[PDB]
Amino acid sequence: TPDLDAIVIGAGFGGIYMLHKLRNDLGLSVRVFEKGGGVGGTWYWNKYPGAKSDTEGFVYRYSFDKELLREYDWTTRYLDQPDVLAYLEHVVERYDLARDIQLNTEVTDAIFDEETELWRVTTAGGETLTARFLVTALGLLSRSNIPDIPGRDSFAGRLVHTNAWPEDLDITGKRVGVIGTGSTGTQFIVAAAKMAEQLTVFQRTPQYCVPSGNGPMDPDEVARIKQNFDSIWDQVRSSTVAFGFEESTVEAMSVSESERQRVFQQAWDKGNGFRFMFGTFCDIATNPEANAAAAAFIRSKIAEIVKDPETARKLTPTDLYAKRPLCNEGYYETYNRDNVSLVSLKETPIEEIVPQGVRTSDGVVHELDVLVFATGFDAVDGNYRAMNLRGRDGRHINEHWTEGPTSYLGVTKAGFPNMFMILGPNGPFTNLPPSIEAQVEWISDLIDKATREGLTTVEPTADAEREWTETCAEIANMTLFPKADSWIFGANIPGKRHAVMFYLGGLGNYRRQLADVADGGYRGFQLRG
Ligand SMILES: Cc1cc2nc3c(=O)[nH]c(=O)nc-3n(C[C@H](O)[C@H](O)[C@H](O)COP(=O)(O)OP(=O)(O)OC[C@H]3O[C@@H](n4cnc5c(N)ncnc54)[C@H](O)[C@@H]3O)c2cc1C
Numbered sequence: 001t002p003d004l005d006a007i008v009i010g011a012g013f014g015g016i017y018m019l020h021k022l023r024n025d026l027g028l029s030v031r032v033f034e035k036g037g038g039v040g041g042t043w044y045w046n047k048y049p050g051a052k053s054d055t056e057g058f059v060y061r062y063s064f065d066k067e068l069l070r071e072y073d074w075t076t077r078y079l080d081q082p083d084v085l086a087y088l089e090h091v092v093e094r095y096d097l098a099r100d101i102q103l104n105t106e107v108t109d110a111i112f113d114e115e116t117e118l119w120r121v122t123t124a125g126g127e128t129l130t131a132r133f134l135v136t137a138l139g140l141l142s143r144s145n146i147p148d149i150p151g152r153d154s155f156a157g158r159l160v161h162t163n164a165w166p167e168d169l170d171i172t173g174k175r176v177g178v179i180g181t182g183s184t185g186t187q188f189i190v191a192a193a194k195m196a197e198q199l200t201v202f203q204r205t206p207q208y209c210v211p212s213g214n215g216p217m218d219p220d221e222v223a224r225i226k227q228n229f230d231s232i233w234d235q236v237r238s239s240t241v242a243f244g245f246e247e248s249t250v251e252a253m254s255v256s257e258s259e260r261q262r263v264f265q266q267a268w269d270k271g272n273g274f275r276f277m278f279g280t281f282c283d284i285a286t287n288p289e290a291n292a293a294a295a296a297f298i299r300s301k302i303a304e305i306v307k308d309p310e311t312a313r314k315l316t317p318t319d320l321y322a323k324r325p326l327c328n329e330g331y332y333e334t335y336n337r338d339n340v341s342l343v344s345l346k347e348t349p350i351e352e353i354v355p356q357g358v359r360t361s362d363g364v365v366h367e368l369d370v371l372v373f374a375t376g377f378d379a380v381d382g383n384y385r386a387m388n389l390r391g392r393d394g395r396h397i398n399e400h401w402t403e404g405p406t407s408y409l410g411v412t413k414a415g416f417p418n419m420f421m422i423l424g425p426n427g428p429f430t431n432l433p434p435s436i437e438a439q440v441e442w443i444s445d446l447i448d449k450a451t452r453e454g455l456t457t458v459e460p461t462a463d464a465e466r467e468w469t470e471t472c473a474e475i476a477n478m479t480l481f482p483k484a485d486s487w488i489f490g491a492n493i494p495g496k497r498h499a500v501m502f503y504l505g506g507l508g509n510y511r512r513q514l515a516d517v518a519d520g521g522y523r524g525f526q527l528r529g
């Protein structure tokens, strides 16, 4: 007999909903462990100025509770961090979840016992307990990556990663530097430039940013959207990227040059990064000719916006438009401010961090009070590999992942019976809340089957998992995404394996795969009583 039916790790969107399903809906005994001092995941940790959703707020929320969709108000087109956090706190209150979420608790070990067919979890505080089922909602974008830049530990001021931003830090009137220009670093830059006495941006790789279109919502428009949420969510769950817009079915090069310009400009004016990539034409990320056209449009905007042509040049990417789409309010415009400087680390790399700042290879010591690492995450697999997570035969998860992280269907793992993953390796690449929902709901159904039928283990086969790897690789190779150097394929961290880590088929196809597996008697699973 285990201590609990189930243990959930993580109290982000994922673990919150998992706890609700397993405790409230199924009536199991459940505990969540979260290493943070508060619930919210991303939206707890990322307290930096400018932190916000790039999913439009209307669909950056749960959908499973229709009354909550009716009731809950948003007032800005995108949601700032404190607003997403307050939403998640409200959900935890609504479903009486806080009583079974244990904060400040890092799980350091999770070990399957093949004799009792139970999981044993160990906390950093030195406690252990057992459960029948283990759900890891560890986050795809949660394990901070802080590069080992020479001299980093000598810096005498406030040195922080964005995912560890301290609530008390006020950068107003300070000399601030930021390393990194992905989604985090760019939205930070926009906010920080308005506060800092001087902002220095250390940019290794410029990205193709488009407008977000953010601003206030008309409350009459929020009421209309609420009235139409059924249809809105149907469209979301059937789409590829789940961002709440209709995805184009038109090949970019099938129209005239003027029509292509007009479509790109309409999207630019409407805002949203995924809208630019997938709402314009159907083949931006698959057809190099189409991709070139999209990239050219954005470069031409950069050239129009940025007044200093050297600064414009340094901001202008020349690689494939196939990193995760970025958007912001007034990003390129920020570089027209007198108090913002841009350092191209291609041209003048960092030589050394020093007590007073950062020294680049031109010998210039950039003096800083605050140095901000917007350097991203050990994405997807980082918190799995960090854990002492062992399955059958006492084998660590790392022994299974020597050519990249793997799963069956994004949510289970061969050799790890009764372990379910929320946004594990090789799952969907979308607006994440509705993918989380698909996964939580699927996992809930399988766990309930186990309960009703008296199953002691559920596990995927090694063949099924290999087949899923091949499926993901095949889909990924039909796209330009593998040729974009970013965190999505592991390439961002030195020594990390370059490998497919997402199913790139989209949410609608992903939901069908899950459904087809379940309706076919859990094709690929060994179910034992
Ligand atoms: C700044 C930022 C903005 C983003 N904006 C968007 C957006 O607009 N749209 C979108 O679709 N996605 C966005 N994302 C991705 C975002 O993480 C997801 O949308 C969603 O918040 C993921 O929820 P989750 O529960 O899967 O993971 P997370 O919110 O990452 O939560 C996982 C939690 O697990 C905890 N944890 C991990 N390991 C352990 C352990 N061993 N023991 C105990 N606790 C542990 C972590 O502390 C963390 O709190 C963004 C990410 C960032 C960083």
Ligand SMILES: Nc1ncnc2c1ncn2[C@@H]1O[C@H](COP(=O)(O)OP(=O)(O)OC[C@H]2OC[C@H](O)[C@@H]2O)[C@@H](O)[C@H]1OP(=O)(O)O
Pocket: 141, 147, 148, 179, 180, 181, 182, 183, 184, 185, 203, 204, 205, 324, 345, 374, 375, 376, 377, 485, 486, 487, 492
């Ligand atoms: N050693 C070193 N030196 C200099 N610069 C470095 C270094 N390591 C990383 N970086 C840069 O930091 C940035 C990290 O971006 P990203 O991984 O997208 O992380 P984000 O947090 O912005 O976004 C991740 C996701 O969170 C939410 C949403 O899905 C986002 O995509 C990027 O500009 C990197 O440049 P590089 O040269 O490109 O590697």
